[PDB]
Design a protein around this ligand. Structure first.
Ligand SMILES: COc1cc(F)cc2c1nnc1c2c(-c2ccncc2C)nn1C
Ligand SMILES: [Mg+2]
Ligand SMILES: [Zn+2]
Length: 322
């Protein structure tokens, strides 16, 4: 696939985060947006503050991050910026609930977050399946998500990027499986089922964090909550992020129009007027339920739901002309 230069990872090793960001990075609403140059360095900081300064060989970690950066395409939304936004939200989740998770879970989850959309071409699973893309022949279900995990393993299996080699054989297999489940849970189709099972478990009082299956379900919803966190930022950031998401949807719809196929309104560039209504529906059907369930299981996660509710109110104000 694609490897980083020696210049790149060496510069990353030298990086020190400014003290004003130290405070701000702990906050859920933190926008990485204005600090592009610092993004690989922000990740290292997060790994170190969550797992410790010596739980990963600095050299190997820097080569990994830099190769991960390289294997993210320059698509409008599913890019390197998205990888770091998702990893930051996970960092904020882990920090506010530190001892609920194991050291192996904290490790794998931050890496799974940075790799979850690895080598995204800007096309949905529906597209790949309907136009019989080689990737759909390889992976029948959760097409992109199984490919993103394949890329993650392939970056690990690269010369001096294998950040986990120093773990036990038992521990290496576990973390690689935590990562597999985490990246697969990021397939939004799987979320709806998972969210309903967790909601029942919470209501009946049967949710037990010591139960592996229950644990894997909670991690899954954390993955979805991190993947959607752009809906959790200040209204001007959230509004701009939706422009990138729709730029990608419209580009996919344009490829269907070129084949004579009419795209769904969401992927139609001619149907922009329907976007505020589409966002309201997504917040009501997907985002609000996700953050609601996450707050019930993990009460410290509450500011995510609070900001989501604020952005929903903003979309209502766009619909009602305010
Ligand atoms: C009608 O609006 C939407 C429809 C939709 F299907 C997905 C999304 C969406 N609106 N905001 C979103 C979506 C996503 C997302 C999540 C996981 N995989 C792919 C994407 C694009 N992230 N964010 C912040
Ligand atoms: Mg994805
Ligand atoms: Zn994603």
């Amino acid at each position: 696939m694609s490897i980083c230069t020696s210049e790149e990872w060496q510069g990353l090793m030298q990086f020190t985060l400014p003290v004003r960001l130290c405070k701000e990075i702990e906050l859920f609403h933190f926008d990485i947006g204005p600090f592009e140059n610092m993004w690989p360095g922000i990740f290292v900081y997060m790994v170190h503050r969550s797992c410790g300064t010596s739980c990963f060989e600095l050299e190997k970690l820097c080569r990994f991050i830099m190769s991960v950066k390289k294997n993210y395409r320059r698509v409008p939304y599913h890019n390197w910026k998205h990888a770091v936004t998702v990893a930051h939200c996970m960092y904020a989740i882990l920090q506010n609930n530190h001892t609920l998770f194991t050291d192996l879970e904290r490790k794998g989850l931050l890496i799974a977050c940075l790799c979850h959309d690895l080598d995204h071409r800007g096309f949905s699973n529906s597209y790949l399946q309907k136009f019989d893309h080689p990737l759909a022949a390889l992976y029948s279900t959760s097409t992109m998500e199984q490919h993103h995990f394949s890329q993650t393993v392939s970056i690990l299996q690269l010369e001096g990027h294998n950040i986990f080699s120093t773990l036990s054989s038992s521990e290496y297999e576990q973390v690689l499986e935590i990562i597999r489940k985490a990246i697969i849970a990021t397939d939004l189709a799987l979320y709806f089922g998972n969210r309903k099972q967790l909601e029942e478990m919470y209501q009946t009082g049967s949710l037990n964090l010591n139960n592996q299956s229950h644990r894997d379900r909670v991690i899954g919803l954390m993955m979805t909550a991190c993947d959607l966190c752009s809906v959790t930022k200040l209204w001007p950031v959230t509004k701009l992020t939706a422009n990138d998401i729709y730029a990608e949807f419209w580009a996919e719809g344009d490829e269907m129009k070129k084949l004579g196929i009419q795209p769904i309104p969401m992927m139609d560039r001619d149907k922009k007027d329907e976007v505020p209504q589409g966002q309201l529906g997504f917040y009501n059907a997907v985002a609000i339920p996700c953050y609601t369930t996450l707050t019930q299981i993990l009460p410290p996660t509450e500011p995510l739901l609070k900001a989501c509710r604020d952005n929903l109110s903003q979309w209502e104000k766009v619909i009602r002309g305010e």
